[PDB]
Design an enzyme around this catalytic site. Structure first.
Site, PDB file in Angstrom:
ATOM      1  CD  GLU A  11     -16.604  36.465  -1.494  1.00 13.37           C
ATOM      2  OE1 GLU A  11     -15.710  37.204  -2.110  1.00 13.37           O
ATOM      3  OE2 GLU A  11     -16.840  35.344  -1.805  1.00 13.37           O
ATOM      4  CG  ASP A  20     -11.993  37.181  -8.394  1.00 15.03           C
ATOM      5  OD1 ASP A  20     -10.984  37.072  -9.205  1.00 15.03           O
ATOM      6  OD2 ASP A  20     -12.920  36.456  -8.508  1.00 15.03           O
TER       7      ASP A  20
END
Ligand SMILES: [Cl-]
Ligand SMILES: [Cl-]
Length: 162
Positions: A11, A20
């Protein structure tokens, strides 16, 4: 290596609101704020999650606190899911981590939808599960991360991460 280090690699860490892979507002170590296209809406979710008026920026410690809650939540979600629990219970340490990674990314319902792969993992048919896992939107949209997780289930080692 462990689950935290693993997800920290997958991440990254960003201390300002960002979008994202799907275009949703997120912050920290993959902490999704909202699917709404509104920045203010994200900022509001952020303040409510941190407990202060952030102005869209958080500290390292604050990111790590969200991360801890998110990892704990994913583990607990697996354990409560009638479909995931038995799989998780049947796996070794390293592979359990791969399952947690997937739930953290796609949510429990999402992972619970991989019926065939789940059954294949439970049966310890590593190579078969790996191929099935790759026939997915997940793998097609985020192939490098998907490949790392898939390698971890296939081999049961952390090789994909060293
Ligand atoms: Cl939260
Ligand atoms: Cl990727």
């Amino acid at each position: 290596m462990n689950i935290f280090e693993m997800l920290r690699i997958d991440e990254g860490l960003r201390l300002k609101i960002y979008k994202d892979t799907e275009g949703y507002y997120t912050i920290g170590i993959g902490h999704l704020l909202t699917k709404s296209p509104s920045l203010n809406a994200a900022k509001s979710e952020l303040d409510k999650a941190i407990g202060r008026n952030t102005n869209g920026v958080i500290t390292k410690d604050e990111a790590e606190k969200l991360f801890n809650q998110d990892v704990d939540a994913a583990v607990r979600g697996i354990l409560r899911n009638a479909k995931l629990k038995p799989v998780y219970d049947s796996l070794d340490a390293v592979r359990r981590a791969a399952l947690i990674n997937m739930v953290f990314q796609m949510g429990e319902t999402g992972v619970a939808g991989f019926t065939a792969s789940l059954r294949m993992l439970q049966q310890k048919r590593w190579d078969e599960a790996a191929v099935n896992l790759a026939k997915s939107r997940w793998y097609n949209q985020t192939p490098n991360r998907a490949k790392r997780v898939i390698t971890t289930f296939r081999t049961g080692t952390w090789d994909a991460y060293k």
